[PDB]
């Protein structure tokens, strides 16, 4: 079973214990660690943070302790305009130039592959995304002729039905990618004012519209569209989403006035690291949707939808019963990497939980 774990560059700038460097990653925890977000300049892959070259090296040395550990660099991200991606992929001239610049880069810095995080291709993009994957993979195969292990190629894909139908030719790209990560944790819609969970596992036998907004449906669909189970990786969140209640109503459907207040170390409205959530739980009321099998907590006018050890193990068993390739954990830097916030002195509580399920068979 694969365990793809993402590490984000900007997590180094968090204050105090919030600060996280590759240094803090247990080399034996995941099977693959993806460095989050390389960039593109003059149609060529390129760094983003001033010291990425140093962190790259720091991350790739973990391989010294664990020979089997594989690493990848991800291109794109949210702070990366989708238009920018779209523009590079539409013109075969800029596309080939981008493709050609990748192998030398990865090879220089010690990565074993590239991860595409084109965050949401549009209806006019489907054709070009296919071209990108097809030609990139071809370049990788060609480069291996030089007698070196072929570079891996994966992609982070949306889990919303509409999003999928609009910009992805799944049957096509599935056959060229080494693995596909399902962003199965952006199900609640940032668009409207209502309390709701972003990573439901199941549909929930209690609300008709938007049955397409849960992990189970997303997986079943990808499988229907032609993606082999042995290439699908289900995404599991290590963070939680916060909202500021607009009323004393805490139950499902409760009105929302906006995002929850920022966290002491995360400093971003609507988001909270799992270690921040561990501190938040103190004096909070904990609830759990039985149908979706995910929890939430409330304290004051703050409503938080998150994932704990049990919801995470739950998702992991699901993943196994459907025989997928494995799990993908978004942000190791959002988990309790120090292991000093969430009671139990365990390091990487959430990611470990997933690993435990995947390893007992």
UniProtKB/Swiss-Prot annotation:
Its main location: secreted. Disulfide bonds join 5-30, 278-342. CDD domains: GH18_chitolectin_chitotriosidase. InterPro entries: Chitinase_II/V-like_cat, Chitinase_insertion_sf, Glyco_hydro18_cat, Glycoside_hydrolase_SF, Glycosyl_Hydrlase_18. One of its GO terms (molecular function) is carbohydrate binding. One of its GO terms (cellular component) is extracellular space. Glycans are attached at residues 39, 345. Keywords: Antimicrobial, Apoptosis, Cytoplasm, Disulfide bond, Endoplasmic reticulum, Glycoprotein, Inflammatory response, Lectin, Secreted, Signal. The keyword Signal applies. PROSITE patterns: GH18_2. Residues 302-316 are annotated as: Important for AKT1 activation and IL8 production. GO terms for biological process: activation of NF-kappaB-inducing kinase activity; apoptotic process; carbohydrate metabolic process; cellular response to tumor necrosis factor; chitin catabolic process; inflammatory response; lung development; positive regulation of angiogenesis. Chitin binds at residues 49-50, 76-79, 120, 183-186, 241, 330. It comes from the Eukaryota. Residues 1-361 form the GH18 domain. It is found in: Secreted, Extracellular space; Cytoplasm; Cytoplasm, Perinuclear region; Endoplasmic reticulum. Carbohydrate-binding lectin with a preference for chitin. Has no chitinase activity. May play a role in tissue remodeling and in the capacity of cells to respond to and cope with changes in their environment. Plays a role in T-helper cell type 2 (Th2) inflammatory response and IL-13-induced inflammation, regulating allergen sensitization, inflammatory cell apoptosis, dendritic cell accumulation and M2 macrophage differentiation. Facilitates invasion of pathogenic enteric bacteria into colonic mucosa and lymphoid organs. Monomer. PANTHER family: CHITINASE, CHITINASE-3-LIKE PROTEIN 1. Belongs to the glycosyl hydrolase 18 family. This is Chitinase-3-like protein 1. The lineage of its organism: Eukaryota, Metazoa, Chordata, Craniata, Vertebrata. The gene is CHI3L1.
